[PDB]
Design a protein around this ligand. Sequence first.
Ligand code: IHP
Ligand code: ADP
Ligand code: ADP
Ligand code: A4Q
Ligand code: A4Q
Ligand code: A4Q
Ligand code: MG
Ligand code: MG
Ligand code: MG
Ligand code: MG
Ligand code: MG
Lengths: 324, 325
Amino acid sequence: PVPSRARVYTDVNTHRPSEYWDYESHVVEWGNQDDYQLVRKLGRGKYSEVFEAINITNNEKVVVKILKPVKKKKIKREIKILENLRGGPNIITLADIVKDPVSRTPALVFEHVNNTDFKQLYQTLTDYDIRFYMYEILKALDYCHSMGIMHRDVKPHNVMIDHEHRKLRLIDWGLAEFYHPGQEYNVRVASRYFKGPELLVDYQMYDYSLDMWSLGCMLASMIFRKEPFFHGHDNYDQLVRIAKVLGTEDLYDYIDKYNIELDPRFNDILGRHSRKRWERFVHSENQHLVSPEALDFLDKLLRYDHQSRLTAREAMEHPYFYTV
Amino acid sequence: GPVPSRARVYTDVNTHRPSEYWDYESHVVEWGNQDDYQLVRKLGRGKYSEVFEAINITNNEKVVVKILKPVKKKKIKREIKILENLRGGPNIITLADIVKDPVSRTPALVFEHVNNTDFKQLYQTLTDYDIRFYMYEILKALDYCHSMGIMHRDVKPHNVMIDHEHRKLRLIDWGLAEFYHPGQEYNVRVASRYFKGPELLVDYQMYDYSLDMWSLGCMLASMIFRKEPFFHGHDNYDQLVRIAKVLGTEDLYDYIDKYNIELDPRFNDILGRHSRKRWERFVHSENQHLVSPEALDFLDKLLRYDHQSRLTAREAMEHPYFYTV
Ligand SMILES: O=P(O)(O)O[C@H]1[C@H](OP(=O)(O)O)[C@@H](OP(=O)(O)O)[C@H](OP(=O)(O)O)[C@@H](OP(=O)(O)O)[C@H]1OP(=O)(O)O
Ligand SMILES: Nc1ncnc2c1ncn2[C@@H]1O[C@H](COP(=O)(O)OP(=O)(O)O)[C@@H](O)[C@H]1O
Ligand SMILES: Nc1ncnc2c1ncn2[C@@H]1O[C@H](COP(=O)(O)OP(=O)(O)O)[C@@H](O)[C@H]1O
Ligand SMILES: CCc1ccccc1-c1ccc(CN)cc1Cl
Ligand SMILES: CCc1ccccc1-c1ccc(CN)cc1Cl
Ligand SMILES: CCc1ccccc1-c1ccc(CN)cc1Cl
Ligand SMILES: [Mg+2]
Ligand SMILES: [Mg+2]
Ligand SMILES: [Mg+2]
Ligand SMILES: [Mg+2]
Ligand SMILES: [Mg+2]
């Protein structure tokens, strides 16, 4: 395959000392759990059990993410990344790192966000509200990309939003990685519906632009009221769902440009598809959330060619956000 | 008999935890593979061990192998359990592995390597700021082990590794450390002579975490006054007389009366009568750059006969001596 590198913040980690990005060598100092009293279960994801808790030393409400048995390397990476980004705009704040004394179980302690329900937001959000939130996510992405980090798991479940206080926080940094120009990354990241074409065709030299694809999938689902937008039933099918909208001509153009070897499992399922106009997804139930600016912005994020997508900074300058 | 005492902080942490946490006799130790380690050179040799620098040949990383001398199996299990409980704590040495010699069956503890700066070479280069910085790093380790229900009981410069170039500090040698259980009577034959608190020297067995705060005070006094050790006893009885020559005998009798302590008759002819000395009397031209009103006030609050009257590690961290760190 042909090499590629990010168009923005390409060398931010190259110019920083090993202490910044070498998470394997990072020294983690675990706090005592006793400061925290667990209140109730909040969530339960792929590699954790999340609890609402009270820090009994200051009466402050927190969230305790009890980590499931995984590679110690992965826990160190999530901790190092959270420490590097701590205080960044709309980045969840890691407050403490604790281990259960008796069971020796790692747990991350975060600021509590009173998260408004996904299906609840889906119905009440206005055209201005969507623009405002997208802009808040873009602030978090431009910041972590500027700090030489790719989230690699951008999706609605990893975006906490307190509507009453208009607060948004990008969470779940467990799949996040440091960007190094020319590095070949694992493509088994992100959640199926939000996976970039680069991941599905097994192109390993990807960058921050992967996050911009995932963000495009989120915007399309909100404006069109179709969740998820690209509804694959497996990883191979996921690319077919993408091809049914963007077309197969631009898909072959993409794989030819990067000299990508397409897996033979795509032989009988990909077919031939024309590019669809974004205007075809507009209906009576969603027309109040769609506009020429929204469609133009969406078209600029949902591109096969990861180099052709808007960067988080270019996205912030788009006419879609002039009202925010 | 003697009046009972208990720690003012973290009193009941072990009482509220299951036996698995503090019952080290029942702890199941799993021995690793010795062949992963190749010994490089001798680093140290204490009362209980021969310590070697080693290479972990599976990852080319430097480690330290502490080969343990013939001692009670109970003591080895205790050190292993405490180290496992404290693993990952701030400035606590990390136990990386536990191994056995396949032939002699000698146990050995494998630790993270610290590139320890020579104490004599450190003694002259350290500034007032460096002393405050390293004292704060030791306090982080002590507040942590005390919060985990453990007393270190051997706090001294030789058990504090400092890699000065990286400003890295590790509290090591947990071989004498014990679990704190309120009301328990402990062996007073712990710590090294110069760092032994008055409770140990008057044979008051119901001591706690505050013993570590006295030892820390001895270390601070030796650094800011450039006098090592600060209390230079020639034996355990004389060690108390050295303390009494500084803190005075009036406060010593006040301490033993408060706890109804029976003073051993061997103190009859050696203790004498001594006035309390002002801390300002130990200030000289060679050490005045390391001394300040805040340093003397902090020192005065750690070096108290009454173990309950001493600052806890957490109160020490809030002291005006640490505002610049
Ligand atoms: O090193 P120095 O500054 O000279 O002082 C010390 C100190 O004496 P002072 O406190 O009276 O200055 C020690 O005496 P004590 O503290 O025990 O009373 C003495 O220790 P010894 O009693 O073991 O001699 C030690 O000697 P050394 O450094 O050899 O241990 C001696 O130093 P001098 O050797 O110069 O007297
Ligand atoms: N800071 C937080 N505030 C409120 N709820 C949270 C917070 N962090 C996580 N949660 C909840 O816990 C769930 C799982 O957390 P997450 O970090 O995504 O773990 P996982 O890696 O297992 O997906 C989230 O989807 C959310 O509902
Ligand atoms: N992690 C370490 N890194 C570097 N040197 C060490 C380390 N642990 C011990 N040493 C050296 O070995 C000596 C003896 O170690 P220690 O644990 O204190 O054993 P003992 O109980 O016999 O005193 C120390 O005083 C120090 O010089
Ligand atoms: C549906 C994607 C989206 C696009 C634009 C604005 C908000 C969102 C959004 C909706 C719900 C949730 C639920 N935690 C999270 C988010 Cl980020
Ligand atoms: C004779 C030294 C020793 C004492 C106790 C436990 C283990 C060891 C030990 C033996 C052999 C080797 C070589 N790979 C390495 C080690 Cl560390
Ligand atoms: C002399 C005690 C002290 C007080 C304040 C700061 C540093 C120290 C100190 C000096 C040397 C050594 C040797 N490993 C260790 C330590 Cl901890
Ligand atoms: Mg998640
Ligand atoms: Mg999270
Ligand atoms: Mg020692
Ligand atoms: Mg040790
Ligand atoms: Mg020992």
